[PDB]
Structures are given as structure tokens and as C-alpha cells.
Ligand binder design. Sequence first.
Ligand code: CLA
Ligand code: CLA
Ligand code: CLA
Ligand code: CLA
Ligand code: 5X6
Ligand code: 5X6
Ligand code: A1L64
Ligand code: SF4
Lengths: 51, 739, 42, 168, 178
Amino acid sequence: SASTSIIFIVVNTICIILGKNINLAELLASMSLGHIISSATVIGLKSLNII
Amino acid sequence: KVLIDRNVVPTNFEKWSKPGHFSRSLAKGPKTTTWIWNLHADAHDFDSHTNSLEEISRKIFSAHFGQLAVIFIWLSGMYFHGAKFSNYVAWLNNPINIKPSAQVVWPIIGQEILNADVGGGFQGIQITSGLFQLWRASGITNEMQLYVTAIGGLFMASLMLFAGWFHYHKAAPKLEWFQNVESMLNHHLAGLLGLGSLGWTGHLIHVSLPINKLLDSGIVPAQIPLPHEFILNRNLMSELYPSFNKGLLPFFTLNWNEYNDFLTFKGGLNPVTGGLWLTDIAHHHLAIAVIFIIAGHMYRTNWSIGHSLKEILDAHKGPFTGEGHRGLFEILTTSWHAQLAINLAMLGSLSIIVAHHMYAMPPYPYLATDYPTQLSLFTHHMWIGGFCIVGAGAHAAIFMVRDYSPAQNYNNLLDRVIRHRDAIISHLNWVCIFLGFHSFGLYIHNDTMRALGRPQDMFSDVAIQLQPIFAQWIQNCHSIAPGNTAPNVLATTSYVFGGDIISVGNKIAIMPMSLGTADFMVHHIHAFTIHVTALILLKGVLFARNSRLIPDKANLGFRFPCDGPGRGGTCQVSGWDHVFLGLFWMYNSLSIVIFHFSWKMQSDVWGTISSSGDISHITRGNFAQSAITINGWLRDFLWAQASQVIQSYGSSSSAYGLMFLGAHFVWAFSLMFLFSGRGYWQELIESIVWAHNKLKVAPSIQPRALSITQGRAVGVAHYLLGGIATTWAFFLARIIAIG
Amino acid sequence: MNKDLLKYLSTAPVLGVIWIAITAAIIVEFNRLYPDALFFPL
Amino acid sequence: KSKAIPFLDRPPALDGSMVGDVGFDPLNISSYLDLRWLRESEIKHCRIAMLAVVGWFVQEVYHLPNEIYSSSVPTEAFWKTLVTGPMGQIVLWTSLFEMISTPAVIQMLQGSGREPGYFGFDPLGLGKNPELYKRFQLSELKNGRLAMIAIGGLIHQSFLTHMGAIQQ
Amino acid sequence: KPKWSKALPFMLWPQNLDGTMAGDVGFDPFGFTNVFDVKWMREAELKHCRIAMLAALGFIVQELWTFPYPYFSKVPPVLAHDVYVKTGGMSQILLFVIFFEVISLFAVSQMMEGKREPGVFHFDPLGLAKDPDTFRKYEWSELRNGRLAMIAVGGFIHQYWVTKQGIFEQLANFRPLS
Ligand code: CLA
Ligand code: CLA
Ligand code: CLA
Ligand code: CLA
Ligand SMILES: CC1=C(/C=C/C(C)=C/C=C/C(C)=C/C=C/C=C(C)/C=C/C=C(C)/C=C/C2=C(C)C[C@@H](O)CC2(C)C)C(C)(C)C[C@H](O)C1
Ligand SMILES: CC1=C(/C=C/C(C)=C/C=C/C(C)=C/C=C/C=C(C)/C=C/C=C(C)/C=C/C2=C(C)C[C@@H](O)CC2(C)C)C(C)(C)C[C@H](O)C1
Ligand SMILES: COC1=C(OC)C(=O)C(C/C=C(\C)CC/C=C(\C)CC/C=C(\C)CCC=C(C)C)=C(C)C1=O
Ligand code: SF4
């Protein structure tokens, strides 16, 4: 589904942007926090049959 | 970083024939029998052997592997006795009408009488450890699986014993390795607890769920597929839980509601087994696994991300508390005693939480209506908790004597606590007197009023009422929570709070526990006994280093008998002596807790139901009117319930009759040590030594009376053993007869 | 046999336990084979 | 620098020594994991992929006797051989090799001198000449890298469809 | 010693395998001899070798011939274990194995003290290896035959459990699996 992927792209992007060669520990940390926030958001919206 | 020194300690038996090699004081050898006792007392006091924190840490790490080996041997033994010497399979087939047994005695001097008639054609000792219920929940259906687990246990034991040897003698970590507390926490949270819980979820979903669902539907154990069949043939699973048809796609796409058939939030109990729903237990462990794996990413290790424990601690300071948590990080990374104190306090407290939670939310099938197991598990775990809490006091005091320094603790929380120790102890003293009078005093009032023929003047449900209204209100909240403040839960966490009477066979598993005056009174007894135990232990810790009486107490050490008869007399001022006294109060406290449990359950919970629905409790509701006087406890509890143990001779319960008397003996023998002193005994020994010298048979290792401290240690150890084993025998004989 | 090991086997508690166990075994085995001797038979 | 991505900079760890080094590491994971470890893993994926590619094609054409071994669709072949026996064996005997390989990887990282992927298997004596060895190493890696992507297609195409590669 | 293991060219020669003992081709990947003494391990190796060789031959001969009395009477080797436990014949073998092993307890202790070589009992009645060079040659054969017999015996017992055939019964038919 698109809506799930959209939420994931947006949330994980914000986590990268606000996270501040590249530093992979920081990237993995940011993406991991993104997955946690994204998963809870999706599951939450699903429960309210919004998504 | 991994930091290690290699080939540190040679492996030979040279030092095994050199007793007390580990200590400068003991290595010279005995002149006196005192040396023999000192050898044992000092064997594991590693920081008294050396000043090196690295050396101490290495011994500890290795000793821990030794403990794990011992635990694996014990665990292996339990499984092996299950496989070889038990009626497990027979019980599996008919769990309502067979008593579990996994110990069988040899026929010598008539002891085969102890092989009781437990059913399933079997004769043996009835066990109360709850192993059978554990194994049923794990999905074990045959003796082969128990045998293989037993063998795996012996393999693990040998592996722990190797690791212990290896990490002491061959590859001992450096101190810097042990002080990696951030890394240790990350691994113990995410790795040990997190992956442990995830792994167990895996077992639950793939093995326990299907097998137990088939057992509960009424399929004969031998006709149930073996665990691997459910893994290889998914259709077997999908028959029982249809969501398995959808596979793992719901997981990765976050359609987790698809799995709501095997991951539930039911609450209450399985009506067939009287245990928690395994689908709830599966979901519990999955949720716990996720939280723990996240928790274990908190602390900074080898990358930029994470918290410094030191930085967190150092930030938490306010206007009432000086430098706050400054200096605690240094304490807790340089003192093993400080770590032990915290960890014993929490492990003990946890054991006590387990006791309460397991009786009220019985997690295993056929646990609740196995009254002997319910009583045994609650009692066992309460005792373990008590002993650990007293240990926390011991190690807190040892820290204060040996590891505390003023320079590390300038105006931090630790310093500020000891600077108002008189305010703390005086107030705790007062609250103990208040609680004592307004709890125990109410029983004495009641005894007096009832003896005088004035029942209307008593504190009771039918006279002057003391209703526990707050507890009653909480019970009500919990009973109405499902579909309200817990909208997606179907039933109460526990039927103890209110709701239905759950029964298995015709036995009551669990039902609401009413709280009245008798419950109010005994709760304030518990408050009292716990506050006094705290008083004694806290006082030991805060006055370990000094007092107005003894300004230089720390120089005398943790464990010393006194500082002489001057200053009025100074017996039992040491930190160790506070642990000694604290043990008696812990014993007193926990004895009343387990007595409360035993009587309340028999009076108001356990029993039979008719088809009509008429509950018949084991002691017929006598608690409300009998448990409000000391005479009621003496008569309706001790005298009445001792009938089983005291009439056990000539039956399979005769062992309990013997243990009951034997335990009374050991208890009374303790008093010889507690009430006397070594001056008397050393003089007596002088006359006896005279007779040996006369007959040229006096030993070169000169006989001495026990040290003052050893006299106390021997006394309290026999007091506890005798006291606790008496209750053990009392409880088991009773509950095995009527339950 | 290794002298250090033999020295360890000679320590009071090891010899204590072994010797008591053998003595106990002898009494057990007498009572297993000739049970219920309240008195010397004559 | 970096030949592959000329606008991005060179990965610090990638100096210019290992075969197939064209400076391609955007994420710079060679800075975080050891390069010997990564190469060891790369070659292992290569060699498994390449065998799996040829396995995909050849299983269409020829079969062994018995119904368990007769299944054109490679995804279907797994299911009939999983519980039967064959896949038990493949797992077991590759596991054996990996168990023996495990300490070799360990002592490589400690610094034995073992190059990553070297098991000293050269019966025919191909790459005894240092010159040939080098160009043979690049081709192994090139072909393995290609096979890694290729086997990805074969599997995913077989999910979309329900036949083999030759059938499709 | 040759630096790289002979058997495993991608692994170093084990640190405590010196190259001098028979059987040594630098095969100890899991590094048992890093922690355990090689003398102890060789003592064990040869005990397994010698028991297995006797077993391998026992399995073979028992299926081709038995002693001409009803007390013996042909059975499959694996089943014979439980047959002769009942008669007391197996307890007899255990009696004399115990005797020799209690004696060996002293031999092994003296080996660990460096007074005895692993596996040596000075047993050569017929004097087949009076020469040092023939002895070292035969040391290698003992290991090689012993190592083979150890596995081979594994075959015999497992293949029986599966096929329910003897050694030669299976070679007469040789039916594949399902
Ligand atoms: C296998 C052979 C072996 C040998 C020869 C050695 C030899 C040695 N060890 Mg080592 N060690 C071993 C195995 C061995 N260890 C293992 C398996 C461990 C992991 C536990 C260790 C961990 C260890 C530590 C932490 C230390 C040693 C130390 C030593 C030295 C002193 C030992 C001594 O005098 O106490 C002899 C003690 C015993 C024989 C008693 C041990 C009791 C065991 C561990 C538990 C018994 C089970 C249970 C409690 C029984 C209860 C019965 C019931 C009635 C209550 C000595 C060089 C010490 C040292 O100072 O070196 C410099 C030292 O601090 N060892
Ligand atoms: C995932 C990593 C991991 C795990 C699982 C553990 C687990 C443990 N450590 Mg910790 N430890 C770790 C990392 C880990 N550690 C790191 C990185 C450090 C350095 C900072 C330490 C430093 C440390 C110290 C100093 C001590 C411990 C101790 C312990 C034991 C605590 C007692 C207990 O709860 O028994 C639970 C028992 C079990 C779970 C059974 C035994 C488990 C064995 C050891 C294997 C577990 C891991 C294995 C990979 C899982 C196999 C999975 C299988 C499917 C293949 C426990 C076995 C204490 C101890 O007792 O040492 C002996 C101790 O003193 N640890
Ligand atoms: C993880 C738990 C744990 C650990 C690792 C330690 C470790 C230690 N304790 Mg602590 N302690 C603990 C829990 C623990 N304790 C608990 C639960 C208590 C409350 C009881 C205490 C109270 C305590 C005191 C008061 C003291 C210590 C001391 C010590 C140190 C030396 C112990 C020694 O050498 O005795 C060797 C062991 C013995 C002599 C064994 C005696 C066995 C007793 C009598 C019970 C046996 C009964 C048995 C279960 C049933 C009957 C047996 C049968 C044969 C009839 C060592 C650092 C001592 C110290 O000085 O530290 C600096 C010290 O004085 N501890
Ligand atoms: C050293 C003395 C010795 C003695 C007295 C025995 C005695 C016995 N063995 Mg044992 N045995 C021994 C050593 C010994 N064995 C040794 C070293 C091994 C190798 C491990 C065995 C392996 C073994 C097995 C496998 C079996 C026995 C059995 C028996 C019993 C056979 C009963 C019978 O019906 O006999 C019948 C006897 C005859 C028909 C006469 C046979 C004459 C021969 C040569 C024996 C005489 C030997 C003599 C004691 C010494 C030398 C004699 C001289 C002429 C040179 C008997 C109790 C059997 C058993 O358990 O039965 C239930 C059985 O199955 N033994
Ligand atoms: C950087 C690079 C780029 C290329 C990158 C590109 C996208 C990478 C392509 C690789 C990927 C996508 C393939 C993914 C392959 C994934 C695997 C390999 C499949 C595993 C399946 C298993 C094996 C389970 C199946 C099983 C299931 C359970 C079904 C069962 O029936 C049986 C089996 C059969 C076992 C470009 C484009 C920019 C060009 C540049 O020049 C270089
Ligand atoms: C290294 C080598 C490789 C070999 C590697 C490979 C994996 C080697 C593994 C071999 C193993 C698995 C043998 C296992 C041997 C199993 C034992 C021997 C079983 C004992 C059974 C007992 C003895 C029965 C007792 C019985 C029971 C239980 C109960 C009773 O009732 C009856 C009796 C009868 C007593 C190769 C292949 C690559 C070739 C290369 O060239 C080098
Ligand atoms: C204030 O409280 C007390 C003391 O002082 C603080 C005492 O001192 C004593 C007296 C008790 C003593 C001296 C301990 C008794 C110890 C025993 C039995 C001796 C041990 C002997 C052996 C191990 C050898 C026996 C050998 C075998 C059986 C194999 C008592 C009763 C006491 O109340
Ligand atoms: S009576 Fe004993 S403990 Fe008290 S002061 Fe005198 S010697 Fe010390």
C-alpha cells in the first residue's frame, strides 16, 4: 500500500534531517527510531480505520 | 574492547592440600581449632584475600560459572527424575485425578511406606514443585523429551564448568572489561532478556500453543503430533489457528491484527485448565521482547550514540540534595558489595512479587487446583525473597565499612543521608512503635474482650468495623476495568478482585477474595513487621562506621563481637550483628505472611463446588471470626491444622511427622547457642582437656570454644532451619491430605 | 598416582566423608540382608 | 574521487589494494566493519549465487529418478525435498564446512595472513602464475556480483509467475 | 614446523601440535590442544581407535559366524547387547574392562607426570615392531585404521537402525531410501 510507504518515507526522512564520512551509526540509529515511530503511527491509524 | 591476560594460573592439585593458601593469616596453618572454622568462613571473602580489584573481579566471574554449573546439574536432575522415576505420562492423560510424583525411595529399614498412592498405578513421594504443570505448558508429552533435556543439561553444566576454569586459569578478563557497564547493560537488556523473551515467544507459538490447544480439546497425548510436525506442516497449525494461512506477510506489512487468533488480550483464565491463556502469554512475551530490545539501545558503547550513565547521574541534583547523584557512578563501578546490595534487594523484592502474581494469575495448566503446588510455590518464593533482602542489608553495611570514602562522597546523597541518620532512625523507631500498638494491640484488645464475654466491644465485621476501604475500592476498579479503562481486554487480570468462581473438576481454582476487618488487621501486622526489619537493617548500615557510642567503629570492621563491657556494654554494635538480628525479624515477618496466605486461601478460596453451585471451603469461612484474636490463630489455625502432620505416623505422610519433630528439635537446640556465651564453654572445655591430657590423648590442634560471632551465626542458622522446616512439614502434610 | 592429588585425598573432610560413607554403607547392607535384628539371635 | 561515483569522495578505508576496488562505498561501511570481513562475506555470497544460478537452469532440463526430485519449478522443488531428505543433507554438509571455516575467519581477523576467500583450492593449477591469479580473482568477483543480481531476478520472476526461467 | 596446516591450507598449524607425533597433519581447527594437553587427547584417541577396530571386526565376524552352541545362536550385533546383558556375559566383559581401566587410571596419571607416552602399554608379544622405523610406520597405520574403524562402526549401527539389515544383507540387496 502507498499510505504505509508514504508515512515511512516521510517519518524516516525527518529522522535523518533532524539527526544532525556519513556516520552509519547515526544513520542506523535515525532509521531505527524512524521505523519505531512509523510502525506505531501506521498501526495506530489502522486501528482508527483512517489508513 | 576485549582485554585479557593469558595463561595466568597453572592447573595442578598442589594448593588443594594446602588449606587456607588463599589467605596470609590462614596459610601458616592451625594452632587451634578456631583456624578450621576461619578457613570456611573466609573462603569466598575474596576482597579480604587481595587488594587488587582486577584479581577480585576475575575470581567472581569464574565463581559465577561455577554457580551456573551447579544449577544446570540440579535442573538436569529434575528432568531426569521426571523421565525415569515419575508418573508424568500417566498424569498427562488424567491430570485432575493423579497426584504428581517424581521421587521414589528404596526399600530399606521400612522406608518404602513413603512411596505414597499417587495414582496412575504409581507409588512415590508427591511433589509440590510444579514441574509437571511447567512441562505440560512447554508441550512435553513423553519421557524421551525429558531424557534429552536432562542430557542437554549435563552438557551445559560441563560447558559452564569449562568456562569457569578457562576464564580464571587461561583467559582472565582485565578490570577495564568488567567496568564496561554501558555495554553490559545493553547486552543484558537486549541480548539476555530481550532475545530470551523473543526465543520463548518462538517456542510458545510453534510448540506450546498447538499442543496445549489439542490437549485441552481432549485429544489423547499419544495421538498429538510431535513439535516439529507443526513447524514442517503449516496446515496442522492453520487448522488450529487460521491466521497461519497468511504466513509472515502481515508482520512485515504491519497488518498485525491478522494474528489476533494466536496473539490475544483475553484476560481471565482458560476454563478447562484453570490457567492463563497461552495466546495471552505468547503476546506478553512478544511485547516484552520488543520493549527490552529497545531498552538495550540506551547506553553509549563503541559509537557516538547513547547515554553515559555517569552523565545522567551527574545531572540529577536539586535544592534539597546538595551535589545529588555525583559520585555514585564511581561507587557502582568500583565496589562489588555496592552492586550486590542493590541486586539482592531487587532480586529478593522480585521473588516476592512472583509469589503474589503466580497464585492470583496462575500461569500453568492445572496449577490452581493443585493446592499443594500453589501453597508450596508462594511459600518458597516468599522465603527466597526475604533472605535476599536481608543480604542486601549485609552487603550495604560491608560497603560502608570497606569501600566508602569521604572524598568520593562530599555533599552527595550518600553523605547527606548519614548526616541525618538520627532523624531517619528516630522516626522509623516511632513508626514501628505506632504500628506495633495499632496492629498487634487490636488483637490483644479482641482477645481480652472475647475472654471477658464482650463480643460487641471487639474489632470485627459484626462489632467495631475496620474496613480496608482503599483496597476494597481498588478491587472494584479492577473488576470494572475490562471494556472500560482497559477497553480491548475481555476479562479481569485476576478473579481475585471480583467476578466469577472458576472451577476445574469440582475444585475451585480462583474466586474473589473479600477483604474485611480481619484482612485490615493482618495487613497492618505486615506493615509493622516489615518496618521493624527495615529499622534493624537500615540502622546497621547508617551506623556501620561510627556512632555516638563508638566513634571509630569502622576500624573494628564489619564483623566483630563488641568493643568490651565498658561504656555500659557494647555487645552487638557491629554491622554484622544487625544482620543477625534482622534475620529473626525477617523470619517473624514472613512466617505471618505465609500463615495469612495459608489460612485465607483455605477459609475463603479453596474448596469444592456442587453442580447446584454450593461452595464448601476447606475451613468453612472461619477466618473472618477466628483470625481477629491470637487465641483464634492458636486454636483454629495452629492446633486445628496440625492434626494432619501430628497424626501422620504409620502412613505415607510419616516423613512429614518426623521432619516436624526433627525441626522442633533443631529450633530448640539453636537456643543453646543464642542464650549462652563462650566464656562458659571455654572453661568447660578446659576440664575435658584435662582428662585427655591425663590419658595422653590431647590433640595438638588445641580445642577452643566457638568465637563469639560464630556462636551467634550457629544460633541463628539453627533457629531459621528449625523454624522454617517446621512450617514446611506442617504445610505439606496438611495440604496433601485435604487438597 | 599423583602425589598432590593423594595429599588432597588425605585431608580430614575427604577422608571423613569417605570413611563415614563406607561405615554407613556397611550398616545399611547388614540391615538390607539381615533385617529387623532387635537382639542377638543366639 | 571514487571512479564509480566521481562527484562523491573516495571511501576512506578503500585505499586501492583489493581486487574489484572501484571506490564504490557510498555508505562507507568499510569504515565501520573490517574490510577482510566484508570481502570474506562478498566472495561467499558470490560463490553461492553462481552455483544457484546454474542450479536454476539445469533443474529445468534434467531430473533424478523418484517423484521428490522431479519438479521443474525450483521453488516447488524445495518443498518436496525439504521434509524428504535432500535439503537436510545440503544444510548439514554445508554447515560442516562452515563450522570448520569459522575458526579460519577468526584467525584471519586476528592476523594469520589468510586472504579473504582463500581455501587453497587449486587442483588444476589455474592461477599458479601471479599474473593469471589476479585477473582470475577479478572475474570471479565480477561474475559473482553479476550472479548475485541474476539469481535475484530468477527467484522474483518465479514468484510473479509460477513456472521456471526456460518455461517463462 | 610447516607454519600452515597440511590438512587445512587456509589455517595455521596448531600451536601445540609440534609435527613430531604420528597422525599429525595439523588438524585441530577448533583448537582443543590450545587448552587440553595433547598427551591426554592422544591417550583418548588411541583408546577409541583400539575399541572401534575390535568393534568393527566384531560386527563383521558375528554376522558371518558364531560359536556352534545354542547359547550363542546368530543374532544381529546391535541386538546381541541386550541378549547377553540378561545372561550375564556382558557383565563378565565389564568386570575385566573395569579391572584394566582401574589400572589404566595409574598409567594416565603417570603419563600426565611425563613418565609414560600416550597409548604405550609395551604390548608386542609377537615382536612385530622391534625396529624403530617399523614401529613409527605401524604407529601411522594404527591411527589410520583406528580412525577409519571409528567412523565405520558409526555407519554399521546407524544403517542398521534405518534399514533393519546387517552389513552384508544390505550389500546383497542395497535398496535405496524413499
Ligand atoms: C579441573 C581441575 C582444576 C584444578 C587442578 C584447579 C586448581 C586451582 N584452582 Mg581452579 N577452577 C576450576 C578447575 C580447577 N582448578 C574450575 C572448574 C573453576 C570454575 C569454578 C575454577 C575457578 C577457580 C577460581 C575462582 C580460583 C581457582 C583457584 C585454583 C587454585 C586453588 C584451588 C584450591 O586450593 O581449592 C580447592 C577447592 C575445592 C576442592 C572446593 C571446590 C568446590 C566446588 C567449586 C563446588 C562444590 C559443589 C557444591 C558446593 C558441593 C556442596 C555439597 C553440599 C553438602 C552442600 C588451584 C591452582 C584459586 C586460586 O587462588 O588460584 C590462584 C581461585 O581463586 N580456580
Ligand atoms: C548477548 C550477550 C550476552 C548474554 C546472553 C549474557 C548472559 C549472561 N551474562 Mg553477560 N556479558 C556480556 C554479554 C552477555 N551476557 C557482555 C558483552 C559483557 C561484558 C560487558 C558481559 C559481562 C558479564 C559479567 C561480568 C557477568 C555476566 C553474567 C551473565 C550471566 C548472568 C546470569 C544469568 O542470568 O544466567 C542465565 C543463564 C543462561 C541464559 C544460560 C547460559 C547461557 C549461555 C552462557 C549462552 C548464552 C548465549 C548464547 C549465544 C545463546 C545461544 C542461542 C542458541 C539458540 C544457539 C548470563 C548467562 C554473569 C555470570 O553469571 O557469568 C558467568 C557475570 O558475572 N556477563
Ligand atoms: C548472590 C548472593 C550472595 C553472594 C554472592 C554473597 C557473598 C558473600 N557474602 Mg553475603 N549474604 C547473602 C547473599 C550473598 N552473599 C544473603 C542472602 C545473606 C543473608 C543471609 C548474606 C549475609 C552475609 C553475612 C552476614 C556475611 C556475608 C558474607 C559474604 C562474603 C563471604 C561469604 C563466605 O565466605 O561464606 C562461606 C559460606 C559458608 C560458611 C556457608 C554456611 C552455610 C549456612 C550455615 C547455611 C547452610 C544451610 C543449608 C542451606 C541447609 C542445611 C544444610 C544441611 C547440611 C543440614 C561473600 C562476599 C560475609 C562477609 O564477611 O563479607 C565480607 C558475612 O559476614 N553475607
Ligand atoms: C579368569 C577366570 C574366569 C572364570 C572362572 C570365568 C567364569 C565364567 N565366565 Mg568369564 N570371562 C573371563 C574370565 C573368567 N570367566 C575373561 C578374562 C573374559 C574376557 C572379558 C570373560 C568373558 C566372558 C563372557 C562373554 C562370558 C563369560 C561367561 C562365564 C561363565 C560361564 C558359565 C559356564 O557355564 O561355563 C561353562 C564352561 C565350560 C563348558 C568349560 C570351558 C573351559 C574353558 C577353557 C574355561 C576354563 C578356564 C579356567 C578358569 C582357567 C584355565 C584352564 C586351563 C585348562 C588352562 C563363568 C561364570 C559366560 C556367562 O556369563 O554365562 C552366563 C559368558 O557369556 N565370560
Ligand atoms: C548498485 C547497482 C545497481 C543494482 C542494484 C540492484 C537493484 C540490486 C539487485 C539485487 C536485488 C534487488 C535482488 C534481490 C534478490 C533477493 C534474493 C537473492 C532472493 C531471496 C529469496 C529467497 C532465497 C527465498 C525464496 C524461497 C521462498 C521462501 C519460496 C520457497 O518456495 C523456496 C525459496 C525459493 C527458497 C544499479 C541498478 C544502480 C546499477 C549499478 O551498476 C550497480
Ligand atoms: C573429516 C572427513 C570428513 C568426515 C567428516 C564426518 C562428518 C565425520 C563424522 C562421522 C561421525 C558422524 C561418526 C559418528 C559415529 C557414531 C557412533 C560410533 C555411534 C555409536 C553408537 C553406539 C555405539 C550404539 C550403542 C547402542 C545403543 C545406543 C543402545 C543399546 O541398546 C544398543 C547399542 C548398540 C549398545 C569427510 C566426509 C569430509 C571426508 C574427509 O576425508 C575427512
Ligand atoms: C555461646 O554458644 C556456644 C559456644 O561458643 C560460642 C560454644 O562453643 C559451644 C560448644 C560447641 C562447640 C565447641 C562446637 C562443637 C563442634 C563439634 C561437634 C566438634 C567438631 C569435631 C570434629 C569435626 C571431629 C569429629 C569427627 C568425626 C565424627 C569424623 C556451645 C554449645 C555454645 O552454645
Ligand atoms: S558479653 Fe561478650 S559480646 Fe558483650 S562485651 Fe562482653 S565479651 Fe563482648
